[PDB]
Design a protein around this ligand. Structure first.
Ligand SMILES: *[C@@H]1O[C@H](CO[C@@H]2O[C@@H](C)[C@@H](O)[C@@H](O)[C@@H]2O)[C@@H](O[C@@H]2O[C@H](CO)[C@@H](O[C@@H]3O[C@H](CO[C@H]4O[C@H](CO)[C@@H](O)[C@H](O)[C@@H]4O[C@@H]4O[C@H](CO)[C@@H](O)[C@H](O)[C@H]4NC(C)=O)[C@@H](O)[C@H](O[C@H]4O[C@H](CO)[C@@H](O)[C@H](O)[C@@H]4O[C@@H]4O[C@H](CO)[C@@H](O)[C@H](O)[C@H]4NC(C)=O)[C@@H]3O)[C@H](O)[C@H]2NC(C)=O)[C@H](O)[C@H]1NC(C)=O
Lengths: 34, 191, 201
């Protein structure tokens, strides 16, 4: 199981220092890179 | 009838969550159903619409994982009848997960049952899957979530196998996905 | 107003001690004309033993009329047809005759990781039965245990059903008590009954 991207996803989904625009971009990056 | 994304599709970044909309009471002779979609009152156009008959129409919209966890509205207008949906902000309890070995009196059968008990969770949306040594196990059934006296849910999953496999296989794993879990993922393993 | 008809409870059918009953329900009756006449027919032969009553449904401010016909165990199992006539509306119910396969019953003891805590779960596994109508209840050497929940029957790839039941108790009770029993009622068992027992020690 790809625990890395899931954990990046999870961490990024709950990251307070990111705005909705930056959140969606980070998630899309994680989602597309893996 | 509108429907939420499957819980596993929502919690896994490697999956594609879909909000579904189904139209009931439609004839075979006038099947042209125009279905629109909105995300927080903003029209989107990337919806897949196929047809079926008993006639009902299944329109599928792809959505962002976070947009459901953040609880945006998802409405499908039909022509007009309008149904919305979103994720309820409710109580969240993470599941306790136990594996029960087969009952002793079953070990003299051809088949044995491996039981996963997942309990004490909120809300009732959960995903339970099986693996052995990392390979996918497909021969299993699960119960629907049941409300427990304390207000939580429990579920049983039964992995059915030949007794040869039970005795010769190193390990089996119950894989749970729920929003109460860190990373939305937990794996319990038995040998 | 519409009408619905309901089969008796499986536990009432299997236990001779209990009276099974067919039930006819007329929903959305009007307050203006509360006159609902309901007659019963066992194999097109009229019976006159049903008790009828009216219910106010506070959920949505509607009225409900429900007719309950007490039937004999043999007639239901032999596939006799039961029909209620409401005035005309007719509804018919009869036992679904099909494959009959007796369940196997197992009691799974609490998982080891749960014995460290102060409550434990006892699990009853019931598999490979047809039809899906079944009764599972727990006892403590005969005495009724009530802190338990069943699941709905699930259709296996076998074509048969399986069902689980979870009895909850404190770990202390699980050690102090002599034994516990999963009691199963199904039409495929001898005498419609089977008792599996487990003991901690
Ligand atoms: C005002 O409120 C009342 C009450 O609403 C009910 O109670 C409140 C508290 C809420 O929880 C509501 O959600 C709840 O529904 C409304 O009255 C209801 O009206 C609906 C119709 O819209 C009826 O639905 C039917 O239900 C039966 C199953 O009924 C059981 O389960 C219901 C819960 O879903 C429960 O409410 C019932 O009481 C009943 O429960 C059983 O009762 C018996 C007897 O007391 C008991 O022994 C059992 O132990 C108990 N079991 C359980 C689990 O509770 C369902 O079978 C019907 O489906 C048929 O009919 C549909 C058409 O309406 C059709 O589309 C279906 O396909 C199906 O058709 C049948 O198909 C089979 C084979 O395929 C065939 O053999 C049949 O002939 C065929 N029948 C027909 C007619 O074609 C249906 O879904 C509710 O029963 C009823 N509730 C009550 C309490 O009467 C009322 O509508 C409200 N008024 C307004 C204006 O809104």
């Amino acid at each position: 199981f790809n625990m890395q991207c899931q954990r990046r996803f999870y961490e990024a989904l709950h990251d307070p220092n990111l705005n909705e625009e930056q959140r969606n971009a980070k998630i899309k990056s994680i989602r597309d890179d893996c | 009838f509108i429907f939420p994304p499957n819980i596993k599709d929502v919690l896994m970044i490697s999956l594609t969550p879909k909000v579904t909309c189904v139209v009931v009471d439609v004839s075979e002779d006038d099947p042209d159903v125009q279905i629109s979609w909105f995300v927080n009152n903003v029209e989107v156009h990337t919806a897949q619409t196929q047809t079926h008959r008993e006639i009902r129409v299944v329109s599928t919209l792809t959505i962002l994982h976070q947009d459901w966890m953040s609880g945006k509205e998802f409405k499908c207008k039909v022509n007009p009848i309008e149904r919305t949906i979103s994720k309820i902000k409710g109580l969240v309890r993470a599941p306790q997960v136990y594996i029960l070995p087969p009952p002793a009196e079953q070990l003299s059968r051809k088949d044995v049952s491996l039981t996963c008990l997942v309990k004490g969770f909120n809300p009732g949306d959960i995903s339970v899957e099986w693996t052995s040594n990392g390979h996918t196990e497909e021969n299993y059934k699960d119960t629907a979530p049941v409300l427990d006296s304390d207000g939580s849910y429990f579920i049983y999953s039964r992995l059915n196998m030949k007794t040869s496999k039970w005795e010769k296989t190193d390990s089996f794993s119950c894989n749970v996905r729920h929003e109460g879990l860190k990373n939305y993922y937990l794996k319990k393993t038995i040998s």
